[PDB]
Amino acid sequence: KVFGRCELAAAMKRHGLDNYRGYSLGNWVCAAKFESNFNTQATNRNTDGSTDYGILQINSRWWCNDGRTPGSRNLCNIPCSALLSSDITASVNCAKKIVSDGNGMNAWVAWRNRCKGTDVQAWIRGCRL
Ligand SMILES: [Cl-]
Ligand SMILES: [Cl-]
Ligand SMILES: [Cl-]
Ligand SMILES: [Cl-]
Ligand SMILES: [Cl-]
Ligand code: NA
């Protein structure tokens, strides 16, 4: 599924991401834009051999199991393929665990380099939420 901007904003809000750990909704929409271009099926292999999955590009090194990341963990207790569904529930629940870790949203490289400090509210402008 390729979400629209406001479509994704509404889904993230319904799942309780708005202001989760203090991060406003536009931070999450911005992160999804630059991580996956709003595409739930996005996958990208990392240099260390792990892979990032889904709308928020969750990494198999710590968070999901894909059977090909030696020495990795599965802390969201989910197959990485479940993070590619059109229903973003699993991705949101796992992202809540990620952002609750010590570094907050800095765990998302694209957020840190392309969203952090910017006018992220622009990402929900015009949305009926
Ligand atoms: Cl593995
Ligand atoms: Cl959804
Ligand atoms: Cl934080
Ligand atoms: Cl950018
Ligand atoms: Cl915002
Ligand atoms: Na893993």
Swiss-Prot record:
Disulfide bonding pattern of the chain: 6-127, 30-115, 64-80, 76-94
Compartment(s) of residence: Secreted
EC number in record: 3.2.1.17
UniProt binding sites for substrate: 101
Keywords: Allergen, Antimicrobial, Bacteriolytic enzyme, Disulfide bond, Glycosidase, Hydrolase, Secreted, Signal
Tissue expression notes: In the egg white and polymorphonuclear leukocytes.
Active-site residues, record numbering mapped to chain: 35, 52
Pfam family, one: Lys
Enzyme class of the recorded protein, top EC level: hydrolase
GO terms under cellular component: cytoplasm; endoplasmic reticulum; extracellular space
UniProt record, GO biological process: cell wall macromolecule catabolic process; defense response to bacterium; defense response to Gram-negative bacterium; defense response to Gram-positive bacterium; killing of cells of another organism
GO molecular function: beta-N-acetylglucosaminidase activity; identical protein binding; lysozyme activity
Highest taxon of the lineage: Eukaryota
InterPro entries: Glyco_hydro_22 (IPR001916), Glyco_hydro_22_CS (IPR019799), Glyco_hydro_22_lys (IPR000974), Lysozyme-like_dom_sf (IPR023346)
Reaction(s) the record says it catalyses: Hydrolysis of (1->4)-beta-linkages between N-acetylmuramic acid and N-acetyl-D-glucosamine residues in a peptidoglycan and between N-acetyl-D-glucosamine residues in chitodextrins
Segments forming domain C-type lysozyme: 1-129
Protein family: Belongs to the glycosyl hydrolase 22 family.
Subunit structure: Monomer.
Additional observations: Lysozyme C is capable of both hydrolysis and transglycosylation; it also shows a slight esterase activity. It acts rapidly on both peptide-substituted and unsubstituted peptidoglycan, and slowly on chitin oligosaccharides.
Biological role: Lysozymes have primarily a bacteriolytic function; those in tissues and body fluids are associated with the monocyte-macrophage system and enhance the activity of immunoagents. Has bacteriolytic activity against M.luteus.
Protein name: Lysozyme C
Organism: Gallus gallus (Chicken)
Lineage of the organism: Eukaryota, Metazoa, Chordata, Craniata, Vertebrata
